[PDB]
Amino acid sequence: MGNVDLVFLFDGSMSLQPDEFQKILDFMKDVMKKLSNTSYQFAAVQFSTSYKTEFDFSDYVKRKDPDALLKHVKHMLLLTNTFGAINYVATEVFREELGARPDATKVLIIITDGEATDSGNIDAAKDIIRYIIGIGKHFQTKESQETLHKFASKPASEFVCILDTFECLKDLFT
């Protein structure tokens, strides 16, 4: 492999209890910590109705403090426009001026529900490896996780998993 540009696109909608949201922040922080000092570069974008880049690549390499980079994050508590969110990342976040690296393989970790409030196509992010982490309890049947497949890369079994175990990210660490 080599250097990769990972972007956390996290669900900041009204469906999450203040607890679940905090679990997402902790999850993100922990993912970043396990990948400290590696070829990885991060950026986080909270989505809901609108999309906000909490911190981008250039911010990461300058601070390298997950906890600090997510200190100011405030729960939006609005809709769940996942489609526009993925498009937002593809065209607005992965930008060289924002700290991205041309040679770096683009990765996107969508920490969400799977229940989107918008339609559309994410054809702009086809070249981005997309993992999808599921928060909430309804992801308790392999058949219920199917709604998440439309956002993640193929095969779905390799890019879709739950936040409690995150069995789809354990390879990134090694």
Under 8 Å between Cβ of 137 and 36: no
- What fold, for 1-174? Rossmann fold (3.40.50)
CA angle 5, 8, 10 (to 5 degrees): 165
Residues contacting residue 115 through CB under 8 Å, at least 6 positions apart: 15, 80, 147
Say how far apart CA 126 and CA 151 lie, in whole Å: 10
- Chain-centroid distance of CA 43 in Å reads 9
Per-residue 3-state assignment (H helix, E strand, C coil) for 123-145: HHHCCCEEEEEECCCCCCCCCCH
Question: How many CA atoms lie less than 13 Å away from 68 in the CB half-sphere?
Answer: 7
SS3 category, 80: coil
Residues contacting residue 53 through CB under 8 Å, at least 6 positions apart: 43, 44, 45, 92, 93
Both tokens assigned to 20: 């679940």
SS3 category, 2: coil
Per-residue 3-state assignment (H helix, E strand, C coil) for 16-73: CCHHHHHHHHHHHHHHHHHCCCCCEEEEEEEECCCEEEEECHHHHHHHCCHHHHCCCC
CB atoms within 10 A of CB 103: 8
- Closest listed residue to residue 158, CA positions, set 167, 146, 150, 148: 167
Domain spans of the chain? 1-174
- Closest listed residue to residue 59, CA positions, set 102, 107, 12, 93: 93
Tokens 């590696």 -> residue: 38
- The phi and psi torsions of 52 (rounded to 5 degrees) equal -125, 125
What method did the depositors use to determine the structure? X-ray
* CA torsion through residues 173, 30, 166, 43, sign: negative
Beta partners for residue 160, in sequence order = 132
**Ramachandran quadrant class, 2 (left: phi over 0; alpha: psi -120 to 50; beta: rest):** left
Under 8 Å between Cβ of 48 and 13: yes
SS3 category, 5: strand
Per-residue 3-state assignment (H helix, E strand, C coil) for 100-112: CCCCCEEEEEEEE
**Is 41 exposed, middle or buried, given 0-12, 13-18 or 19+ CB atoms closer than 10 A?**
buried
